[PDB]
Design a protein around this ligand. Sequence first.
Ligand SMILES: O=P(O)(O)c1cccc(-c2ccc(C[C@@](Cc3ccc(C(F)(F)P(=O)(O)O)cc3)(c3ccccc3)n3nnc4ccccc43)cc2)c1
Ligand SMILES: [Cl-]
Length: 287
Amino acid sequence: KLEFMEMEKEFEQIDKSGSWAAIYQDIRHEASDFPCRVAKLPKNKNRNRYRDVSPFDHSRIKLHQEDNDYINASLIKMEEAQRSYILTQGPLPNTCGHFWEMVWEQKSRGVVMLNRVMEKGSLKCAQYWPQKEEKEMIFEDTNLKLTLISEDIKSYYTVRQLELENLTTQETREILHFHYTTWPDFGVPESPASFLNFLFKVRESGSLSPEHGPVVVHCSAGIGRSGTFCLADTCLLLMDKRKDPSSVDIKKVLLEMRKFRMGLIQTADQLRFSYLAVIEGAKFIMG
Ligand SMILES: O=P(O)(O)c1cccc(-c2ccc(C[C@@](Cc3ccc(C(F)(F)P(=O)(O)O)cc3)(c3ccccc3)n3nnc4ccccc43)cc2)c1
Ligand SMILES: [Cl-]
């Protein structure tokens, strides 16, 4: 089955004819448009990192808390691939509590962070997890306690073991934190290999299994890097479940995803990268 020699030549083709921008732009202007009335209510202003990025009302995550149920987060549900993800923004100083509250209510087992607390000057994200085992964090508002249990730092990413405790029901759960540290805003990963490696680590940890709630994925705004990550994972699942990998149309898959959250994948290059990553990854799995 040198059927991959076709996908790869197809890639070199698009690459050759410099058609990536066209393909990407076409997707942008075909993407779904849905209302985001809740995100725009005056009371939720300070809960949004960015003015022009909001969760659609139909797929937004609702906090089971009584007061205000809003958080800038979206549930992406892929039927065929049979995987779900929650994409959200880098927590704000006033929303770290809400963030971990969502992780608890949705029963997530993993958190995937693709940005850095500080990016190109000025911290583009709050330090929502403990950096020192001995300095756990307590979130007054949502009444949760979080403790760093251990962490394995590597060259382009860090894996952390955390303990999240609901101080009301006195229950505790182990949350795995996968932080990819070398992915610039509006840029691509250091390399396809690093990316796939980080992704396989997330997969084998079982954090993506249907046993748990959906994995929480975020970057700064929760659309560029987060969209690339999920698009790649989902497309890899489809190439394995389809009797014919070539049948996977990444353009359609992204559009499908864009029905749940606006602007997933922010540059023609990220789209290209996700393609490269999917082919390399498939070749590896089907070995
Ligand atoms: O207007 P539409 O409806 O056609 C539409 C549809 C979909 C997306 C957008 C849409 C797409 C991009 C933006 C850029 C952004 C937020 C944003 C930040 C990082 C990332 C990221 F990619 F790096 P990450 O990886 O973290 O996701 C993605 C988005 C912004 C850009 C640069 C710096 C600060 C803010 N921003 N938000 N509000 C703004 C007001 C004035 C100027 C810039 C603004 C806005 C809307 C617009
Ligand atoms: Cl867009």
